[PDB]
Each structure stands twice: as C-alpha cells, then as structure tokens.
Ligand binder design. Structure first.
Ligand SMILES: Nc1ncnc2c1ncn2[C@@H]1O[C@H](COP(=O)(O)OP(=O)(O)O)[C@@H](O)[C@H]1O
Ligand SMILES: [Mg+2]
Ligand SMILES: [Zn+2]
Length: 668
RNA sequence: GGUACGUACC
RNA sequence: GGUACGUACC
C-alpha cells in the first residue's frame, strides 16, 4: 502492499508534492526510491483530476537500476493505473524513443537514451517539455560534463528562452534530484564546500535542498550506522622479496643506462619508465625501450608485493616471461626474434627465478596488511551465525589475487567463508573483465548465501542492490567522501562494522581523515544553504546557472578546433622499427575496428594464441604484438591496435593510444 | 570503439 | 593538460 510514506520521507517529499523543484538528501537504506514513486503517483493523479497531460521520466546511471526500480518500486504501485516501461541501450527495442514517449506515462531509462533523442544526430523529436516531471537518481553526478548535467543544461537554456517569449510560453518539467550525499567536489575549505552545494542546486534548478530534521530520531532508528575502525600496519617486517627485485631492477638499469629520479615501486617511477618506453620507441632505441618495458613489469611486482602476497608478484613476472617465450619462439605453421637485450633479460630472470619462487613460499615475509585483513575477517565471520561482508580494493588484479589468497588457505573455508571476486565490465584494464551477467549472478548468489564475501573494486560502492553486510573493509582503498559514505552504507546489518585496513606508509589513513573532514563540511554547507535567505540563494543560483551555460560554449569551441587525410602517414613497429603499412592501406569496420588491406601483408606477421578471435598478430622480425585476427563477412582480417606502432610522417615520429587521436579520417 | 565521472601521481 | 588505476554509459 500500500503506497504510503514514513514521516521522515513525507517531510522531504512535501515541497515536491506542491510542484517545487528540489533535491532530496536521504541516507542509504532510507527508501529514496519509494519517495520517488509516491511523488510520481501523486503528480500523475493530480494531472488526471485536472484533465491534463501527465508524464514522468526517471533517469538512472547504471543499466541494472532500470530493471531494479521497476521490480521493487515502480511496477507494484503504478502498473495497474498507468503505462510503465523500463528502457536501456542493452535492450534492442523495435520501437523508437519518440513513440515510447507517446505510448507510456512512466519511462525509466538510462540518461543517454534521453540525450540521444534530444541531440538526434540522425534526423518530430523528443523535448524536455514533453515530460511534466523529471526524476534524476543519484543526482550528485549532475555535474561538469556528465550526461545528467547536459540534460539539465538544455533545461536551463529552455528556461532562459521562456522569459524571451513572455516579453516576446513553452512548458517546463518539474525536477526532482535524489541522493545520499551531494558531495563537496574535492574542496578543502568550507567556502568551496558551500560553493559546490550551490552548484549542484544550480544544476538541478532546485528551489531548495531537502534533508530530514523534524523526524531525525525516526530516521536514525531506521538506518543504524556501523562502528568505525582503522586497522593500521606499520610494516617493519624485513622484505627480502622487495630487496632482491630491486637488485634485478638495478642490474637492468646499468645495462640500458636508464636511471630514475624516483624510488623503486612508486608511482613516479611508473610514470618515468612509461615515458622512457615511449621516447625510446620514437627514437629507434630498441635496447632502452625493451628494458624499460621489463623494468615496468618488475616495478609492478614491487607494488603488488606492497598490497598482496609476493606469490602474485612472482606470477606477474613469471607470466610475462611465459608470454615472451611464446612470441619469440619460432613455432610451426609460420610462412631471429631474440635480440641481445631479449636474451640478457630472459637469462637474468631465469638465473634469479629459483630464489624468488622459493622465497615467495615463506608467509612470514608476506605483507602485514594481509594478517590485519585475516585477523579482521576471522573475528568478524565468527561473530554472527549468518554473516556477510565486502572487501573494497583498488585494482582488478588485487581483487582476483585476494580471492585466491582466501581459497588457498583452508582456515577461511573452515570458519565458513565462501569468497568470490567482483569487478568492472569495461575492457580498458590489463586484467580481463566480468560481464554484466556474471556481475548479476555473483550479487544474486551473495543474497542467496552461496557466496559469503565479495572482493570488490569500486563496482560495489554505488547504486546496485547488495545484501546487508556485517563487515565492510576498505583494503587500502580511499577515494572520495561520497564513496566513503556509500561504502559505510553497505554495512547496515545488526552489529555491523566499517574498517580501513592500510599501511601507515601509504598515506591512505590521512586521506580518509580529510574525507571525514569533507563529510562534516558537507553537512555544515547544506545547513548554510538551507538557512540562506531566498534573495541571496536565488542570485547565487542564477550566477552558477549562467556561468555553467558559458562552460559548455567554451568546451564546444575547444572541440571545434580539432575538427586531415589518409596516406600522409606510415606505420613503423615500435620494437624493431620495420616498415609495415602506409596510411592508404588502413580501412575501418563499423567505424571502430581498424584493419590492414595490403595484398602481401601476411608475410610480415605470425599468428599465436594467448573481440572476434583469440589469435594474436605478432611481428615476424621481433615478435611484438600488433593486435589480433578477426572474421568479418567470412574474411580473415588483421585488426591492428594503434598502441603497438610508431607512426611516421612526411614533414616527425609519434605514438598514439587511440585511433581517434590521429588527425586522419579512414575509409569504410 | 566513442564518451563521461572518480582517485592518485606529475 | 598529461600518465596510470578504477568505474560507468552509449
Ligand atoms: N514507506 C515505506 N513503507 C514500507 N516499506 C518501505 C518504505 N520505504 C522503503 N521501504 C522498503 O525499504 C526498501 C528500501 O531500501 P533501499 O533500496 O536500500 O533504500 P535506498 O535506495 O534509499 O538505499 C524497499 O525494499 C522498500 O520496500
Ligand atoms: Mg532504494
Ligand atoms: Zn618488429
């Protein structure tokens, strides 16, 4: 069942029920989406009784939230009274969006489905005037160049144009923002915190920002905060894995004569060594670029030794050199690759390989954070009958490696822990992705009980419905104040704890403290804009709105300048600098995957196993990855990744990470 | 592929 | 603005 609100929910709803644009700030577990449904039904029922056209769009930022808001909230209470539909880019609908607007009263979709129609591109459109109410889920993203903010910039442009036609009357939707924390925008001062709150208010055209105050006690009974802990590890353990890896890196640096201005295993080392790899490739210095590539792989092993067990560090290097054997070795079905440097670096590893493998088997040198994590898990999974937990970590590799650490250790299995990792769907990582369906099944098994502990990246912090946790561990991960409150929001079972496990040397404890500081500033700043007199608030809101419109015009003029011709360019291999393609030889498939056409192109490469296929293309002369094969219309075609080539010009040699960075448009 | 946001380091 | 890690949308 029956559509009602709690008193704290009604308190924040009241102005939206009277037709005012507002932002609603309700904590995690407060039922913000239930408030959205009550306001949707109320809004539509009033439009019926006034014989008027009622229409609502609910905008979300993740695809699963479309289906989730339908099932749990929107269909149960509205389906029998109004036409309701959930829509996404993933679902190939046979109806166009403009028709979906004509047929349905409540549209729940991802924001880019609306923007695609407002833009058109391919050209009677949809406009924001078609909708009488627009609800934005997770409205703290209504910021900068986000899709939310682009939708709302059209709304403000239509608001200003409306006053021009009064003096010489196009209808404007009501707007409702829903969030748990609008944020502080990286501010370190209360002034800049209050500036950020007003900017978000300005972007959503809010009459007022809305929080629970009269029924604050009721809200505190509904959602109980977890107990906070900070488990620090000083790491005064001797670290012979770090020491011997550094000796290998030092040896390599003397060979190539590349010397850093920065500590081993640190972030500026990683920047330097990647810069040095790029430079050496441009300048045809195979010795330097190959060494810098390996040095990076050793620099990875140091920083994963810092966060996870040193066996995973071993495996990172061990797998790299396994793949190096495969590419450099002349196999059958092929129509020397091994340089001096290649031979030097391979033997260096094999020599010092024995020690590292067997040093890695001794857990006494195996990372103090892991014991602190172990101890925290043991004491918490023995605390309750049917517990559930999440470990938040920085890298995908770290998520998978922690899963193996939990599995390759029978005392966690003994005490009832049944772990599984959880990572992103994107394909920009050097680790492989989980698909959206695999993500869904893991989260479903977590609610079932089949799975007990998630080792998650930031995938698990916002939006998605996850079962109430007894423990949330931030394992070395400290991002922003919004993510912090969202992570703390997952721990909402009876007797739940939120814990930061980190090295004192990482500076993550100090960054957690500024995010606590920022969170406190946020509440003071919300309080200040609520107490601000209307005339003062209105003027500041108008300023931010006007200068936000100007902000898009500037970025429009930036992107206009860079707006080629092929055959200007050749393609050299980054490792060995052999001539391979001209610019005329390249053609594109569905304007995304680039392919070579040259008639005698097969002679310049070999095929190896390890998106279309799982067959790599590698350089004949040197074994450098160029990309992979693909099947298109029954033709075996070579897909070349731009990362792998030095691109020469006629007038200059440069390396690009994306095909779009080249100032050249290619054929179909 | 394209784009966006978050964080760290320059 | 750059590099990397992470996430997402089309
Ligand atoms: N006024 C209400 N009456 C009954 N149940 C409610 C009410 N508000 C919320 N709920 C229930 O609580 C749940 C909301 O939890 P959740 O989705 O975690 O909230 P939020 O999205 O704010 O974090 C829903 O399953 C809903 O059925
Ligand atoms: Mg909800
Ligand atoms: Zn080559």
């Amino acid at each position: 069942g029956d559509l009602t609100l709690r008193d704290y929910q009604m308190e924040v709803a009241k102005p939206a029920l009277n037709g005012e644009n507002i932002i609603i700030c309700l904590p995690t577990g407060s039922g913000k989406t239930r408030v959205a449904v009550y306001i949707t039904k109320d809004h539509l029922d009033k439009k019926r009784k006034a014989s008027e056209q009622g229409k609502v769009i609910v905008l979300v930022n993740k695809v699963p939230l479309v289906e989730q808001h339908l099932r749990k909230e929107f269909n149960p209470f509205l389906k029998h009274w109004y036409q309701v539909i959930g829509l996404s880019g993933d679902s190939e609908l046979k109806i166009s969006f403009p028709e979906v607007v004509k047929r349905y009263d409540v549209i729940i979709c991802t924001a880019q489905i609306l923007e695609n129609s407002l833009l058109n591109a391919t050209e009677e459109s949809v406009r924001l005037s078609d909708f009488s109410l627009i609800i934005i889920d997770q409205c703290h993203h209504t910021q900068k160049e986000g899709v939310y903010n682009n939708i709302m910039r059209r709304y403000l442009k239509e608001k200003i144009k409306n006053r021009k036609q009064a003096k010489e009357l196009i209808p404007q939707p009501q707007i409702l923002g829903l969030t748990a924390s609008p944020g502080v925008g990286g501010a370190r001062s209360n002034s800049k915190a209050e500036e950020h709150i007003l900017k978000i208010c300005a972007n959503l055209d809010a009459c007022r920002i809305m929080t629970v105050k009269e029924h604050a006690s009721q809200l505190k009974n509904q959602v109980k905060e977890p107990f906070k802990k900070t488990v620090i590890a000083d790491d005064k353990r001797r670290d012979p894995f770090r020491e011997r890896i550094i000796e290998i890196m030092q040896d390599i640096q003397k060979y190539c004569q590349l010397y850093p201005k920065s500590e081993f295993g640190s972030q500026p080392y990683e920047q330097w060594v990647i810069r040095e790899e790029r430079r050496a490739a441009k300048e045809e210095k195979r010795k330097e670029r190959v060494c810098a590539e390996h040095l990076k792989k050793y620099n990875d092993a140091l920083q994963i030794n810092d966060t996870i067990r040193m066996v995973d560090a071993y495996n990172h290097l061990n797998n790299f050199y396994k793949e190096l054997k495969r590419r450099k070795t002349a196999e059958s079905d092929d129509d020397s690759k091994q340089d001096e440097t290649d031979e030097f670096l391979m033997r260096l590893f094999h020599a010092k390989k024995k020690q590292l493998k067997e040093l890695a088997r001794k857990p006494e040198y195996d990372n103090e954070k892991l014991m602190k994590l172990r101890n925290t898990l043991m004491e918490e999974f023995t605390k309750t009958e049917e517990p559930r937990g999440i470990i938040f970590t920085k890298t995908r590799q770290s998520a998978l490696a922690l899963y193996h650490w939990i599995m390759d250790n029978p005392k966690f299995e003994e005490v009832g822990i049944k772990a599984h990792f959880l990572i992103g769907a994107g394909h920009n990582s050097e680790t492989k992705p989980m698909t959206q369906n695999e993500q869904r099944e893991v989260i479903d098994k977590f609610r079932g009980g089949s799975i007990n502990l998630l080792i998650a990246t930031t995938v698990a912090e916002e939006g998605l419905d996850i079962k109430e946790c007894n423990i949330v561990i931030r394992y070395g991960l400290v991002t922003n104040e919004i993510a912090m409150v969202q992570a703390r929001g997952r721990a909402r079972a009876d007797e739940s704890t939120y814990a930061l496990v980190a090295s004192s040397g990482s500076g993550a404890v100090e960054r957690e403290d500024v995010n606590i500081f920022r969170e406190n500033m946020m509440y003071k700043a919300i309080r200040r804009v609520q107490e601000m007199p209307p005339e003062e608030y209105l003027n500041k809101i108008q300023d931010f709105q006007l200068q936000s419109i100007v902000e898009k015009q500037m970025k429009a003029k930036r992107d206009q300048r860079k707006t080629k011709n092929p055959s200007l360019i050749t393609f050299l291999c980054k490792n060995c600098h052999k001539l391979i393609c001209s610019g005329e030889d390249i053609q594109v498939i569905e304007n995304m995957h680039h392919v070579s056409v040259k008639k005698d192109f097969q002679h310049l490469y070999h095929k190896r196993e390890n998106y279309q296929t799982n067959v790599e293309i590698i350089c004949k002369d040197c074994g450098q990855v160029w990309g992979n094969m693909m099947v298109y219309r029954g033709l075996d075609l070579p897909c070349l990744k731009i990362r792998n080539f030095v691109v020469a010009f006629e007038d200059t040699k440069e390396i690009f990470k994306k095909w779009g960075e080249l100032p050249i448009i290619f054929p179909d």
